[PDB]
Write a protein that binds this ligand. Sequence first.
Ligand code: NAG
Ligand code: NAG
Length: 385
Amino acid sequence: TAPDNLGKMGIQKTPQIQVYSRHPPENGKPNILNCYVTQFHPPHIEIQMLKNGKKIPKVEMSDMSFSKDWSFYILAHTEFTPTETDTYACRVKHASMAEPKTVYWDRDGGGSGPHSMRYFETAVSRPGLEEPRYISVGYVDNKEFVRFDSDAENPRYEPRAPWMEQEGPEYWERETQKAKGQEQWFRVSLRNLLGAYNQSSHTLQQMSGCDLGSDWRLLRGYLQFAYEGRDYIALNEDLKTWTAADMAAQITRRKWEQSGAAEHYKAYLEGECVEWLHRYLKNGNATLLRTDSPKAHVTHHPRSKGEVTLRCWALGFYPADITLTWQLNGEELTQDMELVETRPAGDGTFQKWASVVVPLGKEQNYTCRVYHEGLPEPLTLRWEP
Ligand SMILES: *[C@@H]1O[C@H](CO)[C@@H](O)[C@H](O)[C@H]1NC(C)=O
Ligand SMILES: *[C@@H]1O[C@H](CO)[C@@H](O)[C@H](O)[C@H]1NC(C)=O
C-alpha cells in the first residue's frame, strides 16, 4: 500500500556498468546476458546490447529503482546463445559522459530473515512538456510488485508480481487514486523547489517503507525526500521529528512541524505499512519466502610467473543476502580481498564473486567459504588444478 503525502514543499553521477551471464557460458547452449548499470543520476539513460556490433532486439529493462544514496539502478537483460567467436557488449548513453560507454562481456531481505517494503517515487520535470513524468515502484524484499507511470496512456497502478493478481479491483482503484494525488503533490513541489533554489531538467524523489524482522514486527520506518539527487528532508527514526539538509529544507521542516505531518506518516508506517506487508508476504509465500542455495566454484587467472588471481563464484541463490570470504590457513583475508556488489542475474536469482591475489604455487593454502541461509552448512572450497 502506497503512502499518501500531506503538506507540500516550502549535479551528475556517472554510471557503473557490469556485463555478465546468468549461467557459466557454454557454446551453443541457451543463456541470459545481463547489463547491470548502477549509481547514475539523472535517471534518464539509453542502453543498447550488441552482438558483433549489431543491436540485439527485444532487450528487457527493469526500471526506475534507486538506492539509499538516491542514485538509480537499471538492469537490461536478454536471452542469447553464445558461440566461440561472437563478441558481446553493452553501450550506455548518459548525460554525465561526453560520449557513449561500451563495456564488453568478458567470459571470465527475503527467505526466512528480515523483510521490508519500499515505495520509490520519482518525478522528473521535462523542458519541452508541461507536466513532469511521475513514476512509483513498489518493492517487497528486493522484488518489484507494483508500478505507476504517468507516461502511460491510462496511468494506473499495475501488478508487477503474479501474487498481486489476487487483489480485487477496489485495491487498484484505491492505490491509483493515491498515485494521482502524489502526482499533483510532486508537480507543485517541483515548482516550489525551482524558486526555493532560484533556478531557471530537475528531479524530486521520495522513499517510504517499513522494515520487519524475522518475527514480522516493525523494526523501523522510513520517509525521506531528495531534490536533484541530494538529501532534502527525512523523518527521523522516532517518527516524530525531522532532519533538514539545508536552509531551504529548514523552512519546510518548520511548516511540517506546525501541521503535525509526522503523525500522519507515523500512522502509515506503524499500521498500514506493516499490516499489508504481512498480507503481501503471505500471498507471495511461494516466491518471497523461498530459499535457493548457491552453486559455487573457484576460477584460476594467472597474472605473471609469480602471482595468480583466485575468484570465488556464487550463483543462482535467493535471497540476496550472502557472505563470501577468503581464508589463508584458517584466518580470514577480508581486508585484502576484492568483491563485487551482489547483482541480479535476470531470473529472480543473484550472483556474487570475491577474489584474492596469491603467489603462484600456494593456491592450495587458500580457501573460500560461502554463507547462505539456503545452505545447511557453509561451503568450503579451494582451487582445483
Ligand atoms: C508457506 O506455505 C506453506 C505451504 O502452504 C506453509 O506450510 C507455510 O507455513 C507458509 N509460510 C508462511 C510464513 O506463511
Ligand atoms: C599449506 O599447505 C600445505 C599443503 O597441504 C601444508 O603442508 C601446510 O601445512 C599448509 N600451511 C602452512 C602454514 O604452510
